[PDB]
Design a protein around this ligand. Sequence first.
Ligand SMILES: CC(=O)SCCNC(=O)CCNC(=O)[C@H](O)C(C)(C)COP(=O)(O)OP(=O)(O)OC[C@H]1O[C@@H](n2cnc3c(N)ncnc32)[C@H](O)[C@@H]1OP(=O)(O)O
Ligand SMILES: CC(=O)SCCNC(=O)CCNC(=O)[C@H](O)C(C)(C)COP(=O)(O)OP(=O)(O)OC[C@H]1O[C@@H](n2cnc3c(N)ncnc32)[C@H](O)[C@@H]1OP(=O)(O)O
Lengths: 263, 268
Amino acid sequence: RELVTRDRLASDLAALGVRPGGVLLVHASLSALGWVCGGAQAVVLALQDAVGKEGTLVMPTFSGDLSDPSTWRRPPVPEDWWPVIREQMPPFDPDLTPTRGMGAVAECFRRAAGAVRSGHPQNSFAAWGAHAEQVVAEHGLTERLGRGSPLEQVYRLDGQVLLLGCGFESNTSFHLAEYRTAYPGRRSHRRRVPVPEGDRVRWVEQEDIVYFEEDFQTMGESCLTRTPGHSRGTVGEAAAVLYGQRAFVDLACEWMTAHRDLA
Amino acid sequence: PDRQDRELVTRDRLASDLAALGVRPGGVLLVHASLSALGWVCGGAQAVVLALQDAVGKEGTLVMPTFSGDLSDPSTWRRPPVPEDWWPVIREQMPPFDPDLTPTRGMGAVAECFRRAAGAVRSGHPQNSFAAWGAHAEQVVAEHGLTERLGRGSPLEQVYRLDGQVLLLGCGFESNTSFHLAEYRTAYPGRRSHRRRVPVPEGDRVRWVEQEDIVYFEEDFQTMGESCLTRTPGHSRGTVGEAAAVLYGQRAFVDLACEWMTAHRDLA
Ligand SMILES: CC(=O)SCCNC(=O)CCNC(=O)[C@H](O)C(C)(C)COP(=O)(O)OP(=O)(O)OC[C@H]1O[C@@H](n2cnc3c(N)ncnc32)[C@H](O)[C@@H]1OP(=O)(O)O
Ligand SMILES: CC(=O)SCCNC(=O)CCNC(=O)[C@H](O)C(C)(C)COP(=O)(O)OP(=O)(O)OC[C@H]1O[C@@H](n2cnc3c(N)ncnc32)[C@H](O)[C@@H]1OP(=O)(O)O
């Protein structure tokens, strides 16, 4: 591993094209960077250096565990436990609820001085900087990753997306394209969301779009090459991709309508 | 019980088990927790924080070590040691301790969750901070000085002053920080001092301050622990979920610890 510092990461982010004063949605891997002097704290500081005082950093802070136990599959739980879990699950707390599968950087980021987290109990985002409150305000149940969500806010704020040591499999912005596009064979289903109600949760059944993630690599690579101003490069030891979210999401809508046809 | 023989443990079950162990409502409580020891916690670390907040109540105070031992000189790193060439770079480029940003190391999921709770506050020592929540939180974390990082003018001293209790939740006397308060207070036979480098925050950089400190001796923790505990009036042993738990009065125990070291420690 290469010894990588706060200053080196910040300079490499500027070399990739991270706009001072811009809104930046970050999908980060800590272990891909090399050996980070100061670890996840050094990564967060370098990202704040890159965007500057007038910039904004946004990161997914998903808490997938706050979901019906019948859906659980990494460690599935006994069926006899399901009703106790449903009644006793603590409600989402933006300060207390940890992230799952988001990475050490977002988990370190969410608590930063000035960082604010959105209200969705499963798909919240944390933001820091000039437009942080706007990014996280009124995150609705209707389209958790679409209209009235922080993904829509990054779009309206003409932000960039940084894939830092991870690829299109972590590209949340494709979900914004999925909600906006009536592509052939688009499906819906009913989901259970635990909505906070004091010290308890109130399970609310809601309809939602069924996401499709199999073509993320083919769609990403095709949309990325057609996104004007995009860049590829190395930040530390990590392979990185930087792109304008607006142009890219609009191309993803065009890709889904032309190339998706579900069984 | 699941495939892995773990039993379902809930926030309400943990708070009641804590009340049954003897956790006092309105009291100051210093916690040393293991999440895996508890069983399968419904809501994980967040459910342990909430159950501990329920046990002490609104008038109570929770305190936990939030140590960030990586903020030390690279020459001392052993678990993951780094090339000697990197040491001057590491010394120059290490970010300063930030109470909001710096993660804990070796503290566990519960402390890591706790430190960010609404109303929790964290002390200023770059290696040995504590986080506190509740009625006397600000008092507990306020005076964190360099002279005795785990002694006079440290959150361990505030727990003592406020007549707090100590909870060892699924871990034992190897995690008992209160022993360090006794170590500073007692001139036991072979007590040593050494010099240590502490990175002090200086804006965006660290300033490496060499300071004198007491050398901690930890090999007798279990022997001293069992001896002081059995003589601590009103202590309790019990079960919190699946975890073996110990609850004791910090003032009486720390005082017994000082007497134990004077009588049984003789360092060469
Ligand atoms: C359907 C959808 O698309 S939405 C989901 C959106 N997802 C995201 O935004 C997540 C974006 N991030 C990713 O995708 C990533 O690839 C991840 C987090 C899932 C995987 O990345 P990893 O690098 O494997 O994990 P992470 O970033 O948590 O790093 C911790 C690892 O770094 C290492 N590490 C620890 N300290 C340091 C340091 N100073 N320097 C370098 N590495 C370190 C350790 O190897 C650690 O592993 P351990 O904690 O098991 O010992
Ligand atoms: C010199 C001195 O005396 S001062 C030092 C004082 N130290 C302290 O106060 C720390 C107090 N804690 C301890 O001593 C503990 O024994 C520790 C933290 C060192 C080890 O405890 P562990 O239970 O092994 O770890 P921790 O509490 O972080 O729990 C995480 C483990 O819980 C498990 N886990 C995760 N979710 C759940 C859940 N819902 N339910 C139950 N277990 C879970 C996983 O195994 C996890 O480990 P992973 O992150 O590898 O997946």
